[PDB]
Assembly symmetry: D2
């Protein structure tokens, strides 16, 4: 038996104030240092309980510990995508090109229609959660969905290439109740270079994971 | 605009009676032709609604239609893994080798501890759902978890390589309320060659999807 | 401290074969003796854990134990309503009169319209759960909703007066995947006298319970 | 057929700044005028959809509209209890006497142990939701549970008599990520007279609601 590899909190690809004016420094700081950090530690804690269980050292509720792992691991991986999905205005924002633009054109009828639908999905998440643009390994096509919490409505297979966090701690200090304005503004910091790179990996790698 | 590629019900990799005595023919037929088929149709129905929305032909509740897609797509992908995860006794069953056995040693301290943990996870799914063995792209290690329905507790990243369906329609006609006995018997039809192949692809393909090279 | 009052499995108001041909004996047996009994046992087990913790003997994951209580308690109370909601054909079935028929007319525009709405709610439960007719203490009106598992989508306030169990174990042995036919047949064993009494109590008790 | 009775936003039983310094004015204003109002509107919006469906004017996704009704009705009712559960310091805070204190002693072994269990419940809600003290009609005893969102984990029967909102919009502007300190401070505005009145109503009404002698 080998002790599990621990999850670690990544640094941001930019400073805490680098996404101003669209997302203020205080949100970025709390969101990274408190919230994302909590999910990293929570994922590790659940794996530690599994480890101690397997070593005959403690008793565990398997369902409970796996629910804890699920929520925290999902919080961690969604955030690991979220941060580099954004970039300071200039590098961030604008209109995508490349394969992402092509698929957006073919499936959603262009960037404006895609933007409206993605925005709708993000704005209408019930409670806290995420708006998600994903690559489907079964059809090699894009799909949009919502995730509640970090780990409800998410499915196997689908590869998130672009996500927006609509947990209240992602916008409340700046936009208060007005999630809609937050979502509208977030477009100005989308790192389309990152999304394109994610799509290219998915195009090469995703289908074979399930092809078998 | 071209819109969306449709999902299709795959055939089984074996005859409906091929997993007997462990899973009876009647279950395999209903499970495939009714349940799995419904998820395929449901996934396509949701995408058709999103299509009509994008054409300005209807206004949809986006949340509602995506919940429908999420449930039915998950049902479909989970079943696409479930069927080949199994094999008639002989090719199916027994103890694994290769890379899967290696990671089972490293992560769980051997097959017997892994089996006990996977079985507990499957037996104690609250309501209907799945026991899942997955490859974690972040650490390149195996993880076990439960999924409720098809789309609750599942996370991004994790790649299922071995799944057991513990929806009541997967066992009830044969094992009745005794999900425990169903889980114990299911091990006899596990296609470890298929699991090994999935792990091989995961080891090669999964990490770069999330941590960019 | 006084140790919690234990939950107990009630007997059926009728023999195991009394709802035939609409619900076969093997289902009634399994459903009552195995499934309902499990929820009684689960509810008590969760409270035993809470007690050991209150006595300071063990430390518990409060979230986990409360999730266990929620699911099993809900399973218990829903079934305590479910069994007397039904009655052997003759006592069960037919068309309601009295106060139930009256507000069915007021809220739903008649029995056939109510029936179609209730049947659809029951047939379309995603996964396992319940179709529910409830009384709303805030407006003194009837509402229909679904519950998933036993404890998802249910709300405070609403008092269930008529419930149908659409967990697969409630019908699979007889109807297989055909939940639709099960819902249709179930109408023939509905104890409208029981529903009438429940409504009467709700009319008298429910509103002066929340609005103060 | 008569059109449904509409839900209405009740005003606060105190000024928006009345729970200061424990809950700031801006939070009370936003929470009531924006968030609570939204649930009232959403609950009515769902009922209007059901009404048009019953009149045969539209064919609805029954599951979707009922999910909408569930969430928004729940948000409304939970808030209708939440607001009068609190009171400006003086009337609010301290420790309860009367029947609430008696039941707390018997079920939890005293206020100290109750406060510890309820605080733990509130602080550890996964995602957004509620800590709830409820009256059980089957046993006529108090029970503590969590509710996720407004409508997950809540059961039939159980009658909420004391609730704390731990959605992020209930504390974030003041306490930021520190939900723990919010929960600790919320005890100083609890309107125990209101809780007592709720318990008395439940002792008299709850059990005879599910009785059938």
């Amino acid at each position: 038996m080998v002790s599990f590899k621990r999850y670690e909190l990544p640094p941001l690809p930019y400073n805490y104030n680098a996404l101003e004016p669209y997302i203020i420094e205080e949100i970025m700081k709390l969101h990274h240092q408190k919230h994302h950090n909590t999910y990293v530690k929570g994922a590790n804690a659940a794996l530690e309980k599994i480890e101690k269980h397997l070593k005959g050292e403690i008793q565990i509720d398997v369902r409970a510990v796996m629910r804890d792992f699920s929520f925290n691991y999902a919080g961690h991986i969604m955030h690991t995508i979220f941060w580099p999905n954004m970039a300071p205005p200039g590098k961030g924002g604008g209109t995508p090109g490349g394969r992402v633009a092509d698929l957006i054109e073919k499936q959603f009828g262009g960037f404006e229609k895609f933007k409206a639908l993605f925005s709708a999905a993000a704005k209408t998440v019930e409670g806290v959660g995420w708006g998600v643009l994903a690559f489907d390994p079964l059809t090699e096509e894009l799909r949009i969905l919502q995730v509640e919490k970090h780990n409800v409505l998410m499915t196997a297979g689908l590869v998130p290439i672009l996500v927006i966090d609509v947990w209240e701690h992602a916008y409340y200090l700046q936009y208060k109740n007005d999630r809609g304005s937050y979502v509208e503004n977030w477009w100005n910091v989308v790192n389309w270079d990152d999304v394109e790179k994610r799509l290219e990996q998915a195009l090469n790698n995703a289908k074979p994971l399930y092809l078998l």
